[PDB]
Design a protein around this ligand. Sequence first.
Ligand code: HEM
Ligand SMILES: CCCCCCCC
Length: 478
Amino acid sequence: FLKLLRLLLRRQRLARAMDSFPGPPTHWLFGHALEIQKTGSLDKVVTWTQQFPYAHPLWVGQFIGFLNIYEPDYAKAVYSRGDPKAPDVYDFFLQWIGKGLLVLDGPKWFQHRKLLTPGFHYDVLKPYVAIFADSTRIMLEKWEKKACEGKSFDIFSDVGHMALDTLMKCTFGKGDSGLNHRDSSYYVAVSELTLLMQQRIDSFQYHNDFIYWLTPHGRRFLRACRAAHDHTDRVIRQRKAALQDEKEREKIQRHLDFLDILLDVRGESGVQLSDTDLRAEVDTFMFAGHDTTTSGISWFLYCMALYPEHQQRCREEVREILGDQDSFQWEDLAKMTYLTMCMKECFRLYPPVPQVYRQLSKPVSFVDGRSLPAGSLISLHIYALHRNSDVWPDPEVFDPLRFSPENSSGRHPYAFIPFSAGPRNCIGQQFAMNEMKVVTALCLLRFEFSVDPLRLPIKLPQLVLRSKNGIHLYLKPL
Ligand code: HEM
Ligand SMILES: CCCCCCCC
């Protein structure tokens, strides 16, 4: 009883705050869940976006109500203020990545953010360029054999194994050994975790913790959680043991990679992390550092396939930059200006993270006079934001030149936020951008990509942006 009364009072509170915001009709039980759970609901939200300027309410089951926002001023008003993440959504992370940097709020988040930000300084990243090329070459060898077999194949999983391996070699001290059967067990568990958690987000019956853990869904989730934790436990043990080597420990001790910072080599961290805190940050970054870039690369190579003229331009840019070099140098990534424009245009139409959430700790007033109070829930729809017609002429049209120096000089700084923005932006953005430029550059020099008209990708939200049917492409070796 006590709890049910509070539940209805919040229900009425959240609803009243959004009364100045008209929105689509709500089912009496599911709210908007039934539209959201359909294939294509990202595009149905885009249509709601045209019917309701700026923002519109959004309900999952008549108890939780978000304000879906999709206009730059509205995005800027919230995502510049470092309000906490929406606990109704991010609490589902807890059995999986825990209270790591993505879930933390408040001054503990800033401590860890201060702690981990040196791990992604460009001097730490320069050596990673060589690792990116090695791991890509391993993937491209597999691909030259499949290609000569004549059938189209899904590239997503191969890109993921490659991304996972390159993430661990770069930021977790993995040695030259490479992928092992156990690494694929981790990869498969993330699929299950992001599948199930995305469905929990859209399924209000699964919201209550007590109930969820009794369902087959929740038990499946907790089996996957343990599988992920077995992986991160080994990676941690392995690096503590490897630092017991005299040669190795002397060597590490100017700039430290991600996992060594956490392990507080050289004592300089100035913060003491619990084992819980440590594993949560490893869980968090092991996930965020490969799931996202897998989506980005895979969707990019799809966009290059859809648009061979752009693909050929990118192929010629990177070919001139490489010359007779054995491999690209960190300095070369800046010259890939046109590849970067296509990559941004890809992320506009195919954002690797299409939706994020906040819970306002303070009120906010928007550019049109409407406002919201503290305690309300914000749903940043990056997908619709990037297709906003008031901001992007011909939104569905792929045009890399949208991101030329001239055409972006007066860009609203919150129009194109695939890595978010404000204090809770992506810590890994330049790690990711660098990885993806090196991988896709080598991909284009080695293969020419075309789509499969029989198996065109369908967009599938899954925390990051996946495909219902993979990304099946045809490859020509060169
Ligand atoms: C294509 C690449 C990437 C995309 C699209 C992406 C997207 C995002 C987004 C949208 C956020 C905000 C989270 C929210 O609003 O809830 C974010 C934050 C973050 N990303 Fe990424 N990310 C990328 C690459 C990376 C990489 C490479 C790593 C790890 C090495 C990573 C780790 C994280 C973490 C830990 C945060 C939280 C930072 C904080 O709260 O201070 N991301 N990312
Ligand atoms: C609720 C969706 C958030 C996904 C964040 C992923 C961070 C890279």
